[PDB]
Structures are given as C-alpha cells and as structure tokens.
C-alpha cells in the first residue's frame, strides 16, 4: 500500500552526523547522502504502527558525509548543513532537496560542523588539523580561525552567547573560544585524558554557565564558566551484557554521546558501553541513573552508540533518536524510557533478495555487510521487522534460495566461494560446505538429485569460476560433486565444458538451464543431465535465467525462459516444442521468442510475477528496474529511485502492484507500479 526503503546505515565514529527538527524530521548521514525521516502524526500511519516514513534523500556530495545539523531558527527549520570527505559544506533546502550554497574552505579532512542557535545563518565547521570556518552563509562572509594544533572531534556553539563556541579534541582537550575576538580559549577545560566525543551545554542560562562533556575515557565531566573548572566527574556504570550474543570478533571500544534536555535540567542522558542508554539525575550529583528499556528485554542497541537527537512531536511527545554501530537506528519515549521503533539499515551492497514459499512475505536479503536479513515483510504493527543473522557467515553474501518446503532452512552463499545452511527458526550456527568455490557463489537453486548423489531435494551452488556443483543438505561437510562430470559422461563431450554462470530449474524440477560466460544457455534434462538444447542468443555472461510459474492462466507459460547478460537487451525463450520432443540429440536456438530492448547496461537479475502472465521485471547496471509485458514486448514501468546499479529484484508475493529491488547504493526498495510516472528506461 506504501513504499518503503531500507537505507543505508547511519555513519560511524562522527560526533554529529544526525539531528531532528520539532513536528517533526530527523536527517541522518549515511555513506554519502543524508536520509530523511518524518516522525510523529505528520508521517500519516496507522494507530499502533510506528509513526514513522523514510522521505527523501540529500544527494550531492562524492564521499562520506561526516558531519549534518539543521537549523533550529523558526521558520528555517527547512534549512541544514553539511560536512564531507569532499572538502565541501553545503547548505540544503530540504523542501526542495537542493544546495542553497557552499564552501570548498577546509584543505583538511573536516571533522564536523554545527549551525549557530543564536546567529541564522552561521555554521561552523572544524577539522584534522584544528582549522575552524565561521560561515555566515546568507551574506557571503566567513572566517578562519585555528586555536590549538589538534585533531578536532567536536564543536557545540552556546545556545544563549552568540560568539561562545566549545570545542573538543582528540586528546581530551576542550576550550570555549570567543569568534568575535579571532577565536580567543575563553576557558580551558582540563581534565579528559582521551577523545572527546559530545559537548552539550546546560539549555538554561547561568549556575556564566554549565557544559558537560562526554569522552572516550568513560567520563562525563560538567563545567562551570563562572569557576573555568570541573564541578561534577561522572564515571559510566558497568552492567552486564543484554540481548542476543554478538559477533565476538568485531573490535568496540566505548562511544560517549550526550543529550542536555531542554525540558529537564536537572536530567543528562548519555550512551554507555555496548550501546546502552542512560538518564542521570543530576540532583544526586552518588552517581544515580536510570537505564532506559530497563524492564523490556532486547530493544537496546548491542552496540555503541553514536548521535542522539531530540524530538518533540507536533502532539506533544518528547522523543530521542539513536544511531548506533549496531545499524539500528532507534527512536525511545522519553516519558517511558522505553524503545517506540527500530529502523534497521545496510552496511553493504544488496546483493540478494529472496521470498520463502513456506513462510509467506519471509525476504531474505543478503548483505556487504556480512549478514544475512529476514524481513518479516507482512508483519501487521511493523513496516521494518528485519532479523539479523551474523553466525558463520563473516564475508558478503552474493546468493540465498529459500528451500522450498522445510520452514526456516535458508541456504546462502559469499563472495569468498563458501556455501552455507541456515535453520532460521534456531538460534545454532549455519553448517557450511566443506568444498568451497574458487570465486564468488553467484547462484544457489535446490532441485532433485543426480547422479552420483544418494540423498528430497539436492543444493547446487555455481561460482564464478565456472563450477557448478551439487551438495547433500543433510551432509553438508561430506563430499559436494561437480556435476560436469555427470554432464560430461552423459553427453560424450570431448572438449572442455563451459564455464557456467548461472543455474536455474524449471519449476516442474525435470530440467535444468545452465548459462555459461560465452553468452550461451544449456536446457538438461533429469536423470542425468542429457543435454537436449542449446540456445545462442547472448553474446556475453549470462547473469540471470527465470523459468515462468506453473499457476497461470494457461499450462504453455511454464516452458517461458527468460534471460539476461552483460548486454543491455532481455530474451525470452520458449521451450515447450524441443522438451516435448525430449530429442536424441540436442537443437540449437537461434531466434528469441521474444526480445525485451529498453535498457543502457547489463541486466543482473530477472523475475516473472507470480501474479500474471508473461509479466517480467528487470533489474540493471542502468539504474532502473523494468516492468515489462513479455508476451507483447511492452514496457509498462520504469522505477527510478535508486542511486546506484541494481542486483536483484523480486515481486511481492501478496501485492500484484508491489516490488522489492536490491542495489549497490547500500538500498532495498518495496514500490509500487502504480506510483512510478515512467514507462521506460531512460535512453542516455
């Protein structure tokens, strides 16, 4: 019914690259865009549902985005800036998703920038080497400034003194500087022996004024002006380790972030280690906190988080966002303390995307990042329940295939040449193939047996090294056969065989399509792999190969083959007359049933709907994925929305209008036919 995206993951180890305006809207920075996220009743969701939307995209700058902050002037709410790898800082409209204007005045990687909540148009942005820009963007006037020579980590400009800015390094250092006196230390705060991550400054004015700081060195430390000295050292607490096992292998060191509420003093929240948020009561100054989701188990983050922003919804409710190394990003009631919503992200390219036959709307989606998703899509309270599976797994996952009927066994398989099985119903590590390929797992695809296999259904797995081979599900560690022997013996072949690239059974399971990295497509028929046709229509890497469903409006349907290569033009096959003749010798096909032009570059993944005939859709390096009539060569619908170049593609399995695709922009997308205002690719 609406769209919805899965972004990519809120960046890491950057003391500001998120922040949120009252109604309201959160931005985040994640690779090199920032993602927009209307929350509260201006989202327009169900009651229950979490009142949340992924709405637009900042899109412009080349590398990361390391830094983002909004304005928080009324009635220029819609105004922000950013910082990147790029050397720029640009101001954004986010009404119309366009610079306003920008800067090229850093010469060092920039640390971060924040917008003046005094003066509005000032930002001001810090970087590696200390150098400071003041940019007073609406009348074309900045300023640097450079107080000590150190990393800078962060900068927080005073709420009430115009000129007053706080500044961390990544020595533990921190000054408040006076820009009005060529950036003159004010006071210099001692005491941090390591990186400063968060400086938030008491919101009400006097004891001027308190800051508190929040650093590496597991310390938050609250500072007078009026004194230029500490008043309050708080050390984090050590709790026990909540929710699911982690990944023992990644390296985590403590993030210190903090949130100064507005609308209560005497309260500081701050995250912890492992990702754990706290509220302090800064009245019993015997370290006393409250830890949030203290009664829930596993809605806290696992790991450490980074940004937390403020925002009061135009109903009235006081909510905290939270980024976090575990890619969650999470929004908490504060009046509760416990967890509203989740949105989870990707850390790498979607390589793959496949729907269970067993467990309806169940979307596995293998990931960059090193862990297998399942989106529980159907889910009736959640638009985004996506659970996360890290055991075994520990390198990109290229290939997935659902078992057909055996609830929660999900094969998978990564670019380093592993093949693996999980049982997603139990919380046990995959087992995993003790053949490995030479190259990238492209394909996994379950169909019967052959021989010399005892064992039911049989795994085969095809690399990118040419092999395909078949492996016993229930023996996984045992011997995996490659089936060119069987191929070899059964069609007495003297030459060296193809190199396969793709392996695909007809729905039936009685025949196997192979193709091969000179373009062509082999048809096999069960028992043993006698080859009984062999299509030349492609002249490059075949990719992707799809037989039609068997539960169309006419039997003829299932013996359609559609294909795609490293060309941009789509073919269609019909293999009804050479099966059916089951001939002693093979046939060559030379001529397409039907030729689907359209696309600018190669095609990678290609599905039929399961709700029409002769429907495809189509997935390519050109951006767009292609909804075409296959039966009358017609493209229908052209969707644009992604960045990067499309991996994979699959249909909704209860929405005719609904699709999902995949892409190396770090995206997965569910849209509707129905919403998309192109009918073809675009021609450039």
Known sequence: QEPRTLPPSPNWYCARCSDAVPGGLFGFAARTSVFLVRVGPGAGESPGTPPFRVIGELVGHTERVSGFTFSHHPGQYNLCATSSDDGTVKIWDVETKTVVTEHALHQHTISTLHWSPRVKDLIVSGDEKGVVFCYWFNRNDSQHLFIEPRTIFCLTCSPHHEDLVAIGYKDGIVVIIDISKKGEVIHRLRGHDDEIHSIAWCPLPGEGCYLATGSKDQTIRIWSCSRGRGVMILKLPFLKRRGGGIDPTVKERLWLTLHWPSNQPTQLVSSCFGGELLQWDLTQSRRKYTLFSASSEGQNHSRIVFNLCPLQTEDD?????????????????????ECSWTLPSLGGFAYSLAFSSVDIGSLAIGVGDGMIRVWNTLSIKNNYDV????????????????????????????????????????????????????????????????????????????????????????????????????????????????????????????????????????????????????????????????????????????????????????????????????????????????????????????????????????????????????????????????????????????????IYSGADDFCVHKWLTSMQDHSRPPQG
């Open 387 to 658: 659970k996360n599976f890290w055991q075994g797994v520990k390198s990109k996952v290229t290939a997935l295939c659902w078992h057909p009927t055996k609830e929660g066994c999900l094969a998978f398989g990564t670019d380093d040449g592993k093949v693996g099985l999980y049982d997603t119903y139990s919380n046990k590590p995959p087992q995993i193939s003790s053949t490995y390929h030479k190259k990238t797992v492209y394909t996994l695809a379950w169909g019967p047996p052959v021989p010399p296999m005892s064992l039911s259904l049989a795994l085969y797995s095809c690399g990118g090294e040419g092999i395909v081979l078949q492996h016993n599900p229930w023996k996984l560690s045992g011997e995996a056969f490659d089936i060119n022997k069987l191929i070899r013996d059964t069609n007495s072949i003297k030459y060296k065989l193809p190199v396969h690239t793709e392996i695909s059974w007809k729905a039936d399971g009685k025949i196997m399509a192979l193709g091969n990295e000179d373009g062509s497509i082999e048809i096999f028929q069960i028992p043993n792999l006698k080859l009984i046709c062999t299509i030349q229509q492609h002249h490059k890497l075949v990719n992707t190969i799809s037989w039609h469903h068997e539960h169309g409006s006419q039997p003829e349907l299932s013996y359609l083959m559609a294909s795609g290569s490293n060309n941009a033009v789509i073919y269609v096959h019909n293999l009804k007359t050479v099966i059916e003749s089951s001939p002693e010798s093979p046939v060559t096909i030379t001529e397409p049933y039907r030729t689907l032009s359209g696309h600018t570059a190669k095609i990678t993944s290609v599905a039929w709907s399961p709700h029409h005939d002769g429907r495809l859709v189509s997935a390519s390096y050109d951006g767009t994925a292609q909804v075409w009539d296959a039966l009358r060569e017609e493209p229908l619908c052209n969707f644009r929305g992604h960045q990067g170049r499309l991996l994979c593609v699959a249909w909704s399995p209860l929405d005719p209008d609904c």
């Open 317 to 337: 409710k006081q909510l905290l966002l939270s980024t976090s190394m575990d890619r969650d990003v999470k929004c908490w009631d504060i009046a509760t303390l």
